[PDB]
């Protein structure tokens, strides 16, 4: 079915010319490429595969596959006497090196004249499906003479000279369709847990966590965000997944948490400077889960934030917490519909009563935080969200469902702050109970805490469990010792104000903790409890590794075996001053005399100049180290609304040292 295919190709800095192999061949107007390429060491701009028109006054007159050293992939179609300059392109779409060893990566371009429609997948992954109303073939381009490898040759000269290897490529004078895209063998060092076009319907997904259950079971956790990549305000759910085999393979997800006031919509959102900031404005969510297992009663617990309909963090009250304080009690606030003030309550068993008359009213709220007039549920009608207008808009869309106090159209209405909540599930997460809200742990007149994602920690040598958060000043640990039916806090200050200071602890010894934390000053920084988190320690930092002046999460464990016979702490972050990217794993060892860590290796995750921002890791039950992380930059502007950048690998201790 080819019309022609080569291998092993060495690129280094000279170009190969296979002019008179291909393009006495190329005909029609459709064509599909498909090529298996390493490149460990690349140069900042450099063209794969180059068709032009190499004689003088025809320079802007190629068809190229270009790759840059961030890991972007894009095409370029251009001819100057039909005025077309098409660019299409995706960052963070390539791997580097794995163990080691350069991956080879397996790219498909379709261009297809029937749709009009030009496609790129990488490494099974679709990164981008343009349709234009003007089309033009790759091969159709004026007085097109060259057909070059590792260059573009433009007025005879070599531009965008190449250092990689291509050891396989192959060209067909057809438009492939999607069903025989999916049968291209593929050589990935990665997996998917969760994925665009699963059961959450999310075509997003940030923020991972992981956590290895005592039957050895390993479970995730995710925000499965449906707006685009965008933080609260926004629609986004909590969903899950667990590993019954070392994490070869993975359940399909189900929510933890969720939201019925708008639909669950896949939805391609824009990329480019004009729309990009559209952000889904009138929805409830949830962001930011955190994971922990309780060896007493054998439940599974999760946290996360919650935001009230059009609500994040910009813009929540941050003088409420949201509940009265009656007599040490406290109960939520409501406001109803046609009233200036937060006239009502929710006492014992639902009943809403009137603070202002000191009366019962005839409306109660059930366990799901829905309204009942007279026992009766009332309902308000959903929102769906769409581009079809240019903008976006949100509309009503016929569907009843009920009422709930943390929607827009509801009768009773939550105060406009931060809230969170915690579910647990009887079964290692194959279903998860209704949500309840936790009560707030820093006074009436203070917004709720922000929980640090990742894990909990649960101790050995007891039944304490403890979640990090963070707020203005300090880091707010919160403690359970019944299995989360009551918790307190315990504070550490620390030398920020408004810093995102996301914390991750390991057990050094029994009832001795090291916590790692994000900060402003561009260093991982520590603290230590002796105490089993009753009172911490100042703050230290960690030299040999660099963040931004902003900061990236990084998770933490305590490995369960001895590495040059000593006992180790493996960190997983971006290591650089630029931006997220550079990922490591860097193993500690510890000193057993004074508790202070020697960090001795550091594994390179994948290329310097490559996206990692933020991680889960977890101990498998045969040793080996499961990472799943945001494979992309997911600070900046340019790299926003990526599908399937989330992505798992495993790892074994060898490997790093």
């Given at each position: 079915?080819?019309?022609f295919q080569?291998?092993?190709?060495q690129?280094?800095?000279?170009?190969?010319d296979i002019?008179?192999?291909?393009?006495?061949?190329?005909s029609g107007?459709?064509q599909?490429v498909?090529?298996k390429?390493?490149?460990?060491?690349?140069?900042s701009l450099?063209?794969?595969?180059?068709?032009?028109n190499s004689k003088?006054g025809f320079?802007?007159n190629?068809?190229?596959?270009?790759?840059?050293?961030?890991?972007?992939?894009g095409?370029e179609?251009?001819?100057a006497?039909?005025?077309?300059?098409?660019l299409?392109?995706?960052?963070?779409?390539?791997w580097?090196?794995?163990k080691?060893?350069?991956?080879?990566?397996?790219?498909?371009?379709?261009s297809?004249?029937k749709?009009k429609?030009?496609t790129?997948?990488?490494?099974?992954?679709?990164?981008?499906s343009?349709?234009?109303?003007?089309?033009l073939?790759i091969?159709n381009?004026n007085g097109?003479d060259?057909?070059?490898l590792g260059?573009?040759?433009?007025?005879?000269?070599?531009?965008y000279?190449?250092?990689?290897?291509?050891?396989?490529?192959?060209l067909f004078?057809?438009?492939?369709?999607?069903?025989?895209?999916?049968?291209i063998?593929?050589?990935?060092?990665f997996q998917?847990?969760?994925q665009?076009?699963?059961?959450?319907?999310a075509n997003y997904?940030?923020?991972?966590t992981?956590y290895?259950?005592?039957?050895?079971?390993?479970?995730?956790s995710?925000?499965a965000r449906?707006?685009?990549?965008?933080?609260?305000?926004?629609?986004?759910?909590?969903?899950?997944?667990?590993?019954?085999?070392n994490?070869?393979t993975?359940?399909?997800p189900?929510?933890?948490?969720?939201?019925?006031?708008y639909?669950?919509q896949?939805?391609?959102?824009?990329?480019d400077?004009k729309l990009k900031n559209?952000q889904?404005?009138?929805?409830?969510?949830?962001?930011?889960?955190?994971?922990?297992?309780?060896?007493?009663?054998?439940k599974?617990?999760?946290?996360?934030?919650?935001?009230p309909?059009?609500?994040?963090?910009n813009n929540?009250?941050?003088?409420?917490?949201?509940?009265?304080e009656?007599?040490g009690?406290?109960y939520?606030?409501?406001?109803?519909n046609g009233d200036?003030?937060?006239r009502?309550?929710?006492?014992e068993?639902?009943?809403?009563?009137?603070?202002?008359?000191?009366?019962?009213?005839?409306?109660?709220?059930?366990?799901?935080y829905?309204?009942?007039?007279?026992?009766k549920?009332?309902?308000?009608?959903?929102?769906?969200?769409?581009?079809?207008?240019?903008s976006?808009?949100?509309?009503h869309?016929?569907?009843?469902?009920?009422?709930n106090?943390?929607?827009?159209?509801?009768?009773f209405?939550v105060?406009?702050?931060?809230?969170?909540?915690m579910?647990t599930?009887?079964?290692?997460?194959e279903?998860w109970?209704q949500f309840?809200?936790?009560?707030?742990?820093?006074?009436?007149?203070?917004?709720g805490?922000y929980?640090?994602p990742?894990?909990?920690?649960?101790?050995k040598?007891?039944?304490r469990?403890?979640?990090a958060?963070?707020?203005?000043?300090?880091?707010?640990?919160?403690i359970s010792?019944?299995?989360?039916?009551?918790?307190?806090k315990s504070?550490?200050?620390?030398?920020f104000?408004?810093?995102?200071?996301?914390?991750?602890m390991?057990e050094?010894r029994?009832?001795?903790?090291?916590?790692?934390?994000?900060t402003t000053?561009?260093?991982?920084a520590?603290?230590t409890?002796?105490?089993?988190?009753?009172?911490?320690?100042k703050?230290?930092?960690i030299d040999?590794?660099q963040?931004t002046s902003?900061?990236?999460?990084?998770?933490?464990?305590k490995?369960?075996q001895l590495?040059?016979?000593?006992?180790?702490?493996?960190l997983?972050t971006p290591?650089?001053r630029?931006?997220?990217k550079?990922?490591?794993?860097?193993?500690?060892?510890?000193?057993?005399?004074?508790?202070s860590?020697?960090?001795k290796?550091h594994?390179?995750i994948?290329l310097?100049?490559?996206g990692?921002?933020?991680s889960?890791?977890?101990?498998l039950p045969?040793?080996?180290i499961?990472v799943?992380?945001?494979?992309?930059?997911?600070?900046?502007?340019?790299?926003?609304?990526?599908?399937?950048?989330?992505?798992?690998?495993?790892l074994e201790?060898?490997?790093?040292?």
């Amino acid at each position: 079915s080819p019309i022609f295919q080569g291998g092993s190709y060495q690129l280094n800095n000279k170009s190969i010319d296979i002019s008179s192999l291909l393009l006495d061949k190329l005909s029609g107007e459709s064509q599909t490429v498909v090529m298996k390429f390493k490149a460990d060491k690349p140069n900042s701009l450099q063209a794969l595969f180059g068709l032009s028109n190499s004689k003088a006054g025809f320079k802007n007159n190629y068809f190229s596959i270009f790759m840059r050293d961030s890991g972007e992939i894009g095409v370029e179609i251009r001819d100057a006497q039909k005025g077309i300059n098409y660019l299409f392109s995706r960052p963070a779409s390539l791997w580097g090196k794995h163990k080691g060893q350069a991956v080879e990566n397996t790219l498909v371009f379709v261009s297809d004249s029937k749709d009009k429609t030009y496609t790129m997948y990488v490494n099974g992954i679709e990164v981008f499906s343009e349709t234009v109303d003007t089309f033009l073939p790759i091969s159709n381009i004026n007085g097109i003479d060259k057909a070059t490898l590792g260059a573009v040759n433009r007025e005879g000269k070599e531009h965008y000279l190449a250092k990689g290897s291509i050891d396989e490529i192959s060209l067909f004078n057809k438009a492939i369709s999607d069903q025989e895209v999916s049968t291209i063998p593929l050589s990935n060092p990665f997996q998917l847990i969760f994925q665009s076009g699963d059961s959450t319907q999310a075509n997003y997904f940030r923020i991972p966590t992981l956590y290895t259950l005592s039957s050895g079971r390993v479970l995730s956790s995710i925000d499965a965000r449906y707006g685009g990549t965008h933080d609260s305000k926004s629609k986004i759910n909590i969903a899950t997944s667990y590993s019954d085999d070392n994490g070869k393979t993975w359940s399909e997800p189900i929510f933890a948490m969720k939201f019925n006031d708008y639909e669950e919509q896949l939805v391609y959102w824009p990329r480019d400077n004009k729309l990009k900031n559209s952000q889904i404005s009138g929805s409830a969510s949830f962001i930011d889960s955190s994971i922990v297992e309780d060896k007493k009663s054998g439940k599974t617990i999760l946290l996360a934030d919650v935001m009230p309909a059009g609500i994040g963090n910009n813009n929540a009250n941050k003088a409420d917490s949201g509940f009265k304080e009656i007599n040490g009690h406290y109960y939520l606030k409501l406001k109803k519909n046609g009233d200036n003030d937060f006239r009502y309550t929710v006492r014992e068993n639902g009943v809403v009563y009137n603070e202002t008359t000191n009366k019962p009213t005839n409306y109660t709220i059930n366990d799901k935080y829905e309204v009942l007039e007279g026992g009766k549920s009332l309902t308000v009608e959903q929102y769906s969200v769409d581009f079809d207008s240019g903008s976006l808009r949100e509309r009503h869309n016929g569907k009843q469902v009920p009422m709930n106090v943390f929607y827009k159209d509801s009768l009773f209405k939550v105060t406009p702050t931060n809230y969170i909540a915690m579910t647990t599930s009887q079964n290692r997460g194959e279903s998860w109970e209704q949500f309840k809200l936790l009560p707030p742990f820093l006074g009436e007149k203070h917004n709720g805490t922000y929980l640090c994602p990742g894990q909990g920690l649960a101790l050995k040598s007891s039944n304490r469990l403890i979640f990090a958060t963070y707020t203005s000043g300090e880091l707010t640990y919160l403690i359970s010792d019944d299995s989360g039916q009551t918790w307190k806090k315990s504070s550490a200050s620390i030398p920020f104000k408004n810093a995102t200071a996301e914390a991750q602890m390991v057990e050094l010894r029994d009832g001795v903790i090291r916590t790692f934390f994000r900060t402003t000053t561009g260093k991982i920084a520590y603290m230590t409890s002796r105490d089993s988190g009753e009172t911490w320690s100042k703050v230290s930092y960690i030299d040999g590794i660099q963040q931004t002046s902003y900061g990236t999460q990084v998770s933490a464990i305590k490995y369960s075996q001895l590495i040059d016979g000593k006992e180790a702490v493996i960190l997983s972050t971006p290591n650089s001053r630029s931006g997220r990217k550079g990922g490591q794993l860097v193993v500690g060892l510890v000193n057993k005399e004074d508790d202070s860590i020697d960090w001795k290796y550091h594994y390179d995750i994948d290329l310097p100049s490559y996206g990692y921002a933020y991680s889960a890791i977890t101990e498998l039950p045969n040793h080996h180290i499961g990472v799943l992380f945001e494979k992309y930059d997911s600070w900046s502007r340019n790299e926003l609304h990526l599908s399937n950048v989330v992505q798992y690998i495993d790892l074994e201790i060898n490997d790093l040292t």
